[PDB]
Symmetry: C3
Subunit: 268 residues, 3 copies
């Protein structure tokens, strides 16, 4: 019995994707989420859609309440969270329009809370050191990859996302430097989203859409065109991927995530 959190970023602020949709506002112990939860369905599978930046795209990446967002999805009984993110490419072979099913991340954020266990909440007591060797759910990633192959989508099977604080773009020096650190794509929103998802014991996976090369590489209209196409690629990828997920067993996987998440907490 699965329930799929879906976080929609840039170009997917308010996407018509769910059947039988209901609007639901919640509060959480970490504050309010970016916008109403959108309860709904794809084929037979229960989904919950949420606009990372709010449905009018009014919340900058530094100010996204990632804690509230993941907590609200957890609380609504989500088993998976699949997200999208418009990103810059740091690699010749990752072309504008390409999907990257990222497997790793490099944190360059500085102002964002990264744990539920901050010692200030009684819903999250103790000190948690969550493991990050494998931040993304490999089975959910496997299905995303398989399904994009089916759809005939240009797709990369792994990649390391460097997440910057923003809101500014990179400098050229930084773009070049990120390359030397082994980053493949860049954005402002993966961290700490992915980190909090692990703490919450939720299978998390990210659909990264390369909207353009970052400034290392030697037109707004071209970028907005790429971005709109990318959004439609991502929409089908989700529409086709989510029913595949709803047709396999997950209690196996989910028991191991819930355990890694409990076992990272140190009691007083």
């Amino acid at each position: 019995a699965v329930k799929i959190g879906i976080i929609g970023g840039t170009g997917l602020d308010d996407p018509e994707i769910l059947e039988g949709r209901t609007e639901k506002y919640v509060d959480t112990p970490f504050g309010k989420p970016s916008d109403a939860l959108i309860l709904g369905k794809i084929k037979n599978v229960d989904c919950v859609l949420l606009a990372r930046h709010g449905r009018q795209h009014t919340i900058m990446p530094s100010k996204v309440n990632y804690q509230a967002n993941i907590w609200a999805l957890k609380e609504e009984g989500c088993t998976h969270v699949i997200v999208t993110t418009a990103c810059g490419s740091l690699r010749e072979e990752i072309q504008p329009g390409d999907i990257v099913i990222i497997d790793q991340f490099i944190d360059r954020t500085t102002m964002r809370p990264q744990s539920f266990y901050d010692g200030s909440h009684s819903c999250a007591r103790g000190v948690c050191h969550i493991p990050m060797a494998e931040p993304f759910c490999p089975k959910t990633r496997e299905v995303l990859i398989e399904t994009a192959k089916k759809l005939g989508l240009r797709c990369h099977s792994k990649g390391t996302m460097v997440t910057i604080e923003g809101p500014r773009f990179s400098s050229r020096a930084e773009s070049f430097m990120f390359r030397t650190w082994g980053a493949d794509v860049i954005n402002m929103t993966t961290v700490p989203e992915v980190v909090l998802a692990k703490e919450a014991g939720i299978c998390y996976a990210s659909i990264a859409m390369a909207t353009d090369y970052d400034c290392w590489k030697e037109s707004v209209d071209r970028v907005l065109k790429t971005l709109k196409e990318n959004a439609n690629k991502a929409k089908s990828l989700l529409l086709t991927t989510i029913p595949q997920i709803g047709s396999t067993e997950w209690s196996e996987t989910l028991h191991n995530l819930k355990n890694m998440a409990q076992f990272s907490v140190l009691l007083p």
Copy 2:
């Protein structure tokens, strides 16, 4: 009608550079600037001088009000902001006493707001993703570069500045690490000043003065550097005032306005 904002850093807390000096505190939606603005002129060019750390150098770099400093200068009607910075050298060929007219930076700061568009000020609404592929004004830089040449100053034409949070200096491991990153010089104040200037649509350039090599390899050199930097400024500013800036300024403002996503 240019008007040059000038931000004095280490060694330039309280220089006497302007004619017809006048002084006033000013307010901004972002808080108090580091100190009173000093108004005055260099030849026929209107200038605004501001001490980055206060005139008594009382403000540490993580505590500098970058937003108010740049907003103040903008509201005063500045077209340009030319700044000095006392830096360390990460490169053998950038010798103590050299000037670097930097053209890139790497961010190592952790505590500083980098945008006016934080969602909480009526004067800056929207989400702004400002491009930083080319963070300093190349045209302002080019005049600085040419003027340094005419003055016979040891001057490098470009360089990448790594801005650390501070106020502590870098470990030796860190200094070596920054070299592997392609950093050329190191300081505490370039980020976010430079980012906020672009968001403001002001032409920004930075005269960086190597006081020493960083620890991978003070006071007297620092005094000589301020005097070279002051000379560069006195000679550059009348050149900026004698050339045309409308298209440059129009390109900056358009890029900035284009960066802003409204509801």
Copy 3:
């Protein structure tokens, strides 16, 4: 005359270490330290033990009040602070159970104040730029190195620590990239602890105990490390007591004072 501050990290939250335990809760202009200072002696050397995370290990690395901790140890008269840290290893040659008398750090923290001189406390006036070229006391590190040999402990003589913000662990890609930066071991507590000890003019060194390989490549080896660290401390501290320091502290004290503008 010397007095040895001792900060105990993970596995050393409340060690049975000092002769004649006297419990002293203090306050500082930066807040309360993680817990009571424990006063005591080891072979006639005046010591002050402190639990980094509190005696029940309740405070996470990001929330440790490093300013209150260093300041309290300093007011107490400490000439030296020797600390323990439970770390990950980023090198094949640094195995679980090995000790590393670290000599460098790479800062990867984001949330943490790294100075006393913040312009808001009158006990610490002005702008201070503390040199960090040699963050750890070479004198104190040597004594620790010799003793560890004398004790039969696997021990590396130098090493660069990367201090990440946490509380999460590193991703693989971060862990590979730290190696290429030149880090050898990875923790969450060294920075700004080391930095504040320098400002304070106190001799600082750190016993880093590798509990595992970080993910580029358990609870048992931690308990064993704890023991090895206790030993190293019990034996190291009297050697320091029976050596001369006047010149070292003078130079530390002077560098600290000349860093303030």
